[PDB]
Design a binder for this molecule. Structure first.
Ligand SMILES: CS(=O)(=O)N(CCN)c1ccc(Nc2ncc3cnn(C4CCCCCC4)c3n2)cn1
Ligand SMILES: [Mg+2]
Length: 254
């Protein structure tokens, strides 16, 4: 349906390797979109096409206001182009750099928006597996929007992954609930509960669930995080249960 000459490319958004992402406009509708440009070249040379057609399968047929939209696509046999919803306030990664920490209010608010979106995801049997600030985007009203269902169902940051996954074991939708715990912490503290300087050391830190709270960490948070980051998936809060945590209802600007 679409082709390249359909768009005026604009400002580079991000890099990353996959390829690049550009802001751009549909010539004839004047619509504003994010265009991710992925090279077929390095696509096979690193064998991932199966996860791509599948990111699309999910992200095209999915619909929450807290999930980014794919509109579709096309190719030229050098690259594939994804036609993406554009999130004008950028990454939650960059807000985090910009303010180093977040406050309890913003945080819960993001934890909420993320639980609904995950909740809608898990209703439909889907596990994102890769929610991390760099994949968390922001709408004009400043709402959270999850992107990037690439690794959806050695090598790449361990920080957000739960024991069972990192050890290669049998997992469920409960994994995203560990991520959300790590997320929760990461917002309040400046950096992931399990950070490290190496991947083998982060392997350890995660396997043994070794995290601690800076003094300014309220007990409301200490509780949501302690409960979300239990090694055993059985005893991980349900998504509904999360929305309903005393600390969440008190702080979310829902
Ligand atoms: C300040 S910023 O980092 O947040 N930023 C400017 C970049 N130098 C920025 C980044 C992203 C956006 N919007 C936007 N809209 C839609 C999408 C869809 N995929 N992506 C990826 C996700 C972020 C990682 C970089 C690659 C781009 C999108 N990004 C705006 N401003
Ligand atoms: Mg992908």
């Amino acid at each position: 349906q679409w082709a390249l000459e359909d768009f005026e490319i604009g400002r580079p958004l991000g890099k990353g390797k996959f390829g690049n992402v550009y802001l751009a406009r549909e010539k004839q509708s004047k619509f504003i979109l994010a265009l991710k440009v992925l090279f077929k070249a390095q696509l096979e040379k690193a064998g991932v096409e199966h996860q791509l057609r599948r990111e699309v399968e999910i992200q095209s047929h999915l619909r929450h206001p807290n999930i980014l939209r794919l509109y579709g696509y096309f190719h030229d046999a050098t690259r594939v182009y994804l036609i993406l919803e554009y999130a004008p306030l950028g990454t939650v990664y960059r807000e985090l750099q910009k303010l180093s920490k977040f406050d309890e209010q913003r945080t819960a608010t993001y934890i909420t928006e993320l639980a609904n979106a995950l909740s809608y995801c898990h209703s439909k049997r889907v596990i994102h597996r890769d929610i991390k600030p760099e994949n968390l985007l922001l709408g004009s009203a400043g709402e959270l929007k999850i992107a990037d269902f690439g690794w959806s169902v050695l090598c790449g940051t361990l920080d957000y992954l739960p024991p069972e996954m990192i050890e290669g074991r049998m997992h469920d939708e409960k994994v995203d609930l560990w991520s959300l715990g790590v997320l929760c912490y990461e917002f309040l503290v400046g950096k992931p509960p399990f950070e490290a300087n190496t991947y083998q050391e982060t392997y350890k830190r995660i396997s043994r669930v070794e995290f601690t709270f800076p003094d300014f960490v309220t007990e409301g948070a200490r509780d949501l995080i302690s409960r979300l980051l239990k090694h055993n998936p059985s005893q991980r809060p349900m998504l509904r249960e999360v929305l309903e945590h005393p600390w969440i209802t008190a702080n979310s600007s829902k």
